[PDB]
């Protein structure tokens with residue numbers, strides 16, 4: 205499953221040639237965290253930045269039990285500076301040098317399980333429909349892989 209994440213994250217990064225790809229997973233209370241990353245050589249890994257560069261707290265998704273994702277909606281942002289985010293949100297994005305990004309839902313069964321994010325640093329992006337569609341397909345495949353990893357867990361407890 206780590207294998208799966210690594211595999212998925214590297215694929216998205218190479219297919220989109222973006223700076224960073226992240227996998228987010230929700231906890232039962234809709235808190236969550238980034239559990240996997242694929243990142244280009246030029247940037248420091250997320251966990252390392254988190255040990256040194258503090259952020260504004262962000263409980264939005266938790267307070268809203270998944271927000272737009274829960275309704276199968278995605279976020280596609282060509283330019284974060286132009287998007288109209290709250291100041292704290294934009295400040296967080298800017299802390300990670302994120303200038304354009306995509307975030308899509310990952311569903312495991314009919315349950316919102318997490319998110320798949322793709323980030324471009326330093327310059328805006330004109331995202332294309334096929335890039336978004338491809339990310340959704342990869343997110344669906346990830347969801348299936350997780351769903352079946354679960355199924356196989358349930359199987360091996362039951363013997």
Ligand SMILES: *[C@@H](C)[C@H]1/C(=C/c2[nH]c(/C=C3N=C(/C=C4\NC(=O)C(CC)=C4C)C(C)=C\3CCC(=O)O)c(CCC(=O)O)c2C)NC(=O)[C@@H]1C
Pocket residue numbers: 228236237238254259260261262263264265271272279290291292293296307
């Ligand atoms: C300012 C911070 C207010 C706020 C705004 C806000 N945030 C989101 C959505 C997201 N915020 C995050 C951020 C994190 N996830 C993490 O694991 C970490 C630690 C490194 C951070 C900083 C993420 C992943 C999301 C989902 C993707 C996105 O960037 O939008 C929203 C929803 C925006 C929308 O329209 O969908 C909003 C409004 N959060 C707060 O708590 C402050 C009041």
Ligand SMILES: O=S(=O)(O)C[C@@H](O)CNC1CCCCC1
Pocket residue numbers: 271272287288289290
């Ligand atoms: O739209 S929702 O009700 O999910 C939540 C609300 O926080 C919207 N975020 C704005 C949307 C437009 C881009 C800037 C950020």
Ligand code: NA
Pocket residue numbers: 262263264265266
């Ligand atoms: Na949040």
Ligand code: NA
Pocket residue numbers: 271272279307
């Ligand atoms: Na969002």
Ligand code: NA
Pocket residue numbers: 288289290293294
């Ligand atoms: Na915002």
Ligand code: NA
Pocket residue numbers: 351352
């Ligand atoms: Na299945």
